[PDB]
Swiss-Prot record, chains A, B:
Subunit structure, as described in the record: Homodimer, whose active site consists of two apposed aspartic acid residues.
Peptidase A2 domain location: 20-89
Coiled coil: none
Protein name: Protease
Region (Dimerization of protease): 1-5, 49-55, 88-99
Active site: D25 (for protease activity)
């Protein structure tokens, strides 16, 4: 639905059968989740931002329910402080910015 | 107005009399701009994210026009890869998320 931004935009997500809290982030190209165990094969790949680069594992065709809406895409797993839902997934659930 | 997220949400901003490109980021609590010169006094303060922490300078009561909408608030200046418009300012222009 609609979400103001006075507080961190946190939502409930279901992935790999577990429930977690994730941040809807328009400033992230990709989706990166904390340490957890996922399906098939993966590859290295690195992501950057404020400070330095961190190593992540890339998983494709991963199902994920955000705030109750179905979606399938690429998910990254590495040493991140928080769960980040990027634009790759924010598009599937038709998430847009408005002002 | 409305903005999809298939591409990085970039907008035109006017601050300190100069024109710059900035990213509207719902995943950022604060607003951090690249190296530039601003008004009054400032203080250290540090911000974190993916990788490591970076040093920034804090400036308050700074005017800033985003996509053409007026706003005044705190702006950070440091070694950042991009210009980031955080929730402190995204609220003033009434920016919300929708899906
Ligand atoms: C969580 C990350 C995936 C996120 N980073 C990204 O979306 C960045 C651009 N992408 C990123 O690391 O992926 C692409 C890339 C990979 C290798 C070499 C060069 C570029 C991040 O820290 N994002 C923040 C700030 C930001 C934005 C643009 C550039 C740097 C930092 C908040 O939105
Ligand atoms: C551009 C930054 C201001 C941005 N960081 C933030 O908004 C973070 C939580 N805040 C941050 O550094 O400020 C608060 C703080 C200060 C000192 C000690 C502990 C916490 C960032 O890298 N944001 C990305 C990822 C992210 C989100 C939450 C936590 C870590 C990384 C993209 O949204």
């Amino acid at each position: 639905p609609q979400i103001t931004l006075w507080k961190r935009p946190l939502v409930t997500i279901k992935i790999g059968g577990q429930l977690k809290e994730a941040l809807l982030d328009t400033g992230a190209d990709d989706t990166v989740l904390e340490e957890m165990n996922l399906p098939g094969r993966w590859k290295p790949k690195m992501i950057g931002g404020i400070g330095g680069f961190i190593k992540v594992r890339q998983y494709d065709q991963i199902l994920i329910e955000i705030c109750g809406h179905k979606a399938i895409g690429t998910v990254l797993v590495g040493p991140t402080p928080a769960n980040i839902i990027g634009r790759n997934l924010l598009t599937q659930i038709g998430c847009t910015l408005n002002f």
